């Protein structure tokens, strides 16, 4: 479960929304905009869930 820190991908596409991404580095969550083909897992249609990603390993 290495999808804690991933790269930002916004692509393109006609889904204009933000979504919650976890990062390492510090174990933080942001948003990010994501609307179209989905790149890496930085993306996330739910709060919580974020943490999720990292929750398998440090989180």
Same mark, same amino acid.
């Given at each position: 479960?290495?999808?804690?820190?991933?790269? +930002?991908?916004? =692509?393109?596409?006609?889904?204009?929304?933000?979504?919650?991404? !976890?990062?390492?580095? +510090?174990?933080?969550?942001?948003?990010?905009? !994501? =609307?179209?083909? =989905? =790149?890496?897992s930085n993306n996330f249609l739910?709060?919580?869930?974020?943490?999720?990603?990292?929750?398998?390993g440090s989180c």
């Amino acid at each position: 479960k290495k999808k804690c820190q991933l790269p +930002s991908d916004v =692509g393109k596409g006609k889904a204009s929304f933000t979504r919650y991404y !976890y990062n390492e580095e +510090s174990g933080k969550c942001e948003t990010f905009i !994501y =609307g179209g083909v =989905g =790149g890496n897992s930085n993306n996330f249609l739910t709060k919580e869930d974020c943490c999720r990603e990292c929750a398998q390993g440090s989180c």
